[PDB]
Symmetry: D2
Subunit: 251 residues, 4 copies
Amino acid sequence: SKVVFITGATSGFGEAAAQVFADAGWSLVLSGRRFERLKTLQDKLASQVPVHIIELDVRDSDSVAAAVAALPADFADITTLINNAGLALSPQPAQKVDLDDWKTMIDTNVTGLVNVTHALLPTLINHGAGASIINIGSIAGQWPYPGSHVYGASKAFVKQFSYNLRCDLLGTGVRVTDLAPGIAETEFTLVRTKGDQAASDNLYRGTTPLSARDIAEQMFYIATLPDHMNINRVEVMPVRQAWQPFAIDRD
Amino acid sequence: SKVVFITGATSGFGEAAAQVFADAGWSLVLSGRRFERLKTLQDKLASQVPVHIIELDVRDSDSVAAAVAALPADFADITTLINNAGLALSPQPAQKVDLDDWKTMIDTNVTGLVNVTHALLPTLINHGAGASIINIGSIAGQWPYPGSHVYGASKAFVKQFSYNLRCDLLGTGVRVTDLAPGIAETEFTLVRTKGDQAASDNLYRGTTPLSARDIAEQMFYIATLPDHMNINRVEVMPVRQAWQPFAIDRD
Amino acid sequence: SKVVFITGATSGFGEAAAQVFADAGWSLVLSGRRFERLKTLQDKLASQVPVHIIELDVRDSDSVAAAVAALPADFADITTLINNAGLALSPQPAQKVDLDDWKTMIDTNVTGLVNVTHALLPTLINHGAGASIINIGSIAGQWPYPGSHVYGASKAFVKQFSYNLRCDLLGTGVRVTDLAPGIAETEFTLVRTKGDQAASDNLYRGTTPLSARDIAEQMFYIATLPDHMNINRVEVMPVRQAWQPFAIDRD
Amino acid sequence: SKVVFITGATSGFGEAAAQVFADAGWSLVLSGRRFERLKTLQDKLASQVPVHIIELDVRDSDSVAAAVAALPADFADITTLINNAGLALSPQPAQKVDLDDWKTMIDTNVTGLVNVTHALLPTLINHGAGASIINIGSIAGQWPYPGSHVYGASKAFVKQFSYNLRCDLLGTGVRVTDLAPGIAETEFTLVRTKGDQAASDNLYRGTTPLSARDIAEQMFYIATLPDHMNINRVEVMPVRQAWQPFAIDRD
Ligand SMILES: NC(=O)C1=CN([C@@H]2O[C@H](COP(=O)(O)OP(=O)(O)OC[C@H]3O[C@@H](n4cnc5c(N)ncnc54)[C@H](OP(=O)(O)O)[C@@H]3O)[C@@H](O)[C@H]2O)C=CC1
Ligand SMILES: NC(=O)C1=CN([C@@H]2O[C@H](COP(=O)(O)OP(=O)(O)OC[C@H]3O[C@@H](n4cnc5c(N)ncnc54)[C@H](OP(=O)(O)O)[C@@H]3O)[C@@H](O)[C@H]2O)C=CC1
Ligand SMILES: NC(=O)C1=CN([C@@H]2O[C@H](COP(=O)(O)OP(=O)(O)OC[C@H]3O[C@@H](n4cnc5c(N)ncnc54)[C@H](OP(=O)(O)O)[C@@H]3O)[C@@H](O)[C@H]2O)C=CC1
Ligand SMILES: NC(=O)C1=CN([C@@H]2O[C@H](COP(=O)(O)OP(=O)(O)OC[C@H]3O[C@@H](n4cnc5c(N)ncnc54)[C@H](OP(=O)(O)O)[C@@H]3O)[C@@H](O)[C@H]2O)C=CC1
């Protein structure tokens, strides 16, 4: 009778997390916008565990509020909320980015994460011991780099929102954790280049990035943590990723 | 000449910054939503320096773009942009905040700050050498505390967005700085308590907070920095403000 | 075979980690200054797994270099180095601290930590895939608080020292992790009060702090991580610990 | 009068800071190990302001204590303490650095800085309003990069040690500030490369780094700050210096 609420379960980390929690007997609540991928994932996982799918755009707060209020009884009691739904766009410098791409990232990684958190806060508090809010931040939320502009800032929002939630949830038993992954081969770079599969292959070629299951098993590790423990933040990078020297402009 | 673009100049830091730059001969272009106090500030400063006022709400991207397009010739060439427009709401714990208060802060401190930057990015690059983007962050953008929930997260967005802007504007000479002040006695706390001056008066009592003009003299220092220097972030607190021990839940 | 090098294994995290790694078949190399506790620990764990004890003061670099050079063949191949040996002193304000207490923390938490890394760096690089350097930092290495002065600064050193090591160890496969725990009931506060067990009971009374086995299981989780992954930093606090409001000096 | 205690005044920031403080009538106390540079600065500056020189190695606490106790009456009342004495060594990767170079960095930037503060803390507290402890950090104290190993970690120590000092000195009016500069042509790389002038010219070539007087003029700005304000940290970079993308090991 353990239920996990996974946003953005149609691909990447969310899709892998649905399978990792299913192998552990957890009931699943999978959301996203590609409904025909949720139906495909439901039919593959309804055998193992009970599955509840939702066609949900996290940028619409009224839809998320309705989706949480309309949860059936076999799902309403959420133990773990995984705020995974997110995206990056326009990897070019900030002076060459369209403002609608900046708005799409803010609406999903900031407002979308705050929309889902607000809707599930009473549910997670009414659970209590063992409850976890797993916010998926990024290494970009701490380390600046060219082409990150609003994506990294949105993930720094996610980091501080996680710490601030802990200050206000003291005594409720609810845990808030920022899982901040490094470079990982999912649909992330494909969405970030608006469909340039060659770019998403030249980036990961010749290196060992994180797999989608690497982050999913980290989500499960955080969710099954003992009730008295709380991870403030985990920054997970592939060991083949680090930091370069400072950029110095030269004549 | 030298022109400053000040958002949210109707009160607090913004109105005090208008007087600090006027005393140095800088031309002013001040924005905000309460036009009737902007007109009062214009007539007080039109003697010292030429002033152009704009009724602008930073949450409207189309209005911000039009406001920049309608800039007079003696004003369009902005040297320093001060992204001062911001607000906090609901000092209660996060589990007791209405979602409209969270949306208002994201729409103003996050979306509003990127709206002004996007519209003026071509303008600031065509200036160069001495151009500066002064983003008004906060200690809340780095340090968590109870009741900050989305405010601190929004100011952490501003911190990382400033660093990321520096990565993309390398070689243009344009400077980006996060001015992160501590507690200061302005109209700020009145907005955060929805009009309770008594709550805004129990604060600042018996202590020496920062003044509104004090941050202005610090904003002017950043704008007048030599062209080859760039301050990534300066966190200025009143010397009577610091950090408490960790919160420990007991029985 | 897999061998772990644990500094400060006589109590707390190191002693608990020795039992957790013994339960997984890992060969142990336990160091410390209390030799009569290392001898008792060898008999408790030599049954399950081969154990090698070393009387070592990490502040003596020549003693550390000789101790690693004198490793037997069934131990020389170190997979995981856990730099756990550390201590805090003088919880009073900095202006009332004796400098020898400041020096002991620097000699142990800073110099002692780089001494062990310097002595074992060639061994870990000659290991390669799966090797880990687990530096035991603290929440004090990121968040300032009263009574933390050189202790928190020493743990901020280890945080950045871990990040900097990763930049230089790219391509060697060895992983560096800052495990930064929160408040935990060990001999830690006993050493910080120079033996006041009453003070170490008034601190932990009425709350649920971290156990030594909680952090010990975190070391094992990090050490057994898949070879391609690397945890930059994990800050684990007891869920009953968070951040207080800002300190404001008042009349 | 007003007296400044400057460590590491034989070159770079310390030597340049001596002239800027002399231009304001402040009495000077300059330390360092190269006496023939201290005597030359005294003969050049004894005209403007009274100067007291000390051949002091900050690594010997007893000498630091003796130098502070033996201050003449026209010097003992120090207003601003600038912990500037510091150094980096071995720019090669950490696995190819001799431990004696690591100890020199820890002894000077960590142990040496706490030695000077411990000896001068009672005097600065007995000064009261306007006293400042200006710790010279670095961008290396926050941002990791290859070749920084112990230098960046030591500057992370000073960053957190600055924050922690404010928690213990709350209400005394004495200010603690982390001045974290970027790349600067300050004879730093010459000492840092063990005398390689060719390497110290290719680093600053074709770019505009910070000057010793640029940072010196920043030290004076912090020292002349109003007594009620405190700069927690100011990170000053050349606008032609920023952050590069993440390092990815390939092939
Ligand atoms: N991959 C990486 O390198 C890193 C990724 N991350 C974070 O990991 C998380 C997962 O991204 P990843 O899985 O890697 O990339 P994917 O594109 O593979 O996953 C994207 C997920 O986000 C969902 N999503 C996007 N926008 C919305 C929306 N408005 N409403 C609902 N669901 C939405 C998608 O579902 P649909 O499109 O069907 O709505 C999809 O399930 C993201 O938050 C990303 O920032 C963090 C660090 C590094
Ligand atoms: N007060 C403090 O102690 C601290 C303040 N700050 C920052 O200082 C900045 C200024 O606030 P402060 O100076 O404190 O005093 P105020 O909070 O009184 O200034 C608030 C400003 O926000 C402007 N504003 C709000 N919504 C909009 C909008 N949609 N479009 C344009 N302007 C808008 C207001 O202009 P109008 O109301 O006329 O629209 C007003 O001038 C804020 O960003 C705050 O985060 C940072 C750290 C600490
Ligand atoms: N416990 C807590 O609340 C927290 C602890 N930490 C870190 O945990 C680590 C220690 O675990 P702790 O919890 O302190 O458990 P203890 O302090 O009870 O055990 C600490 C160990 O450090 C060893 N040690 C200390 N100084 C030296 C030295 N100079 N040379 C060799 N060995 C030494 C001791 O062995 P001997 O005495 O036999 O030499 C002892 O076994 C420290 O690094 C501490 O900073 C981090 C965050 C919170
Ligand atoms: N240069 C840069 O680009 C950056 C510098 N910094 C910091 O700023 C400070 C100045 O660097 P820089 O401007 O290069 O000046 P230098 O590094 O050229 O020399 C600085 C001073 O350190 C003193 N010093 C070194 N070791 C000791 C010691 N053991 N005891 C006493 N004094 C000592 C030297 O005097 P002696 O002749 O007695 O050795 C010298 O006067 C340093 O602390 C450095 O860490 C920070 C960021 C970047």
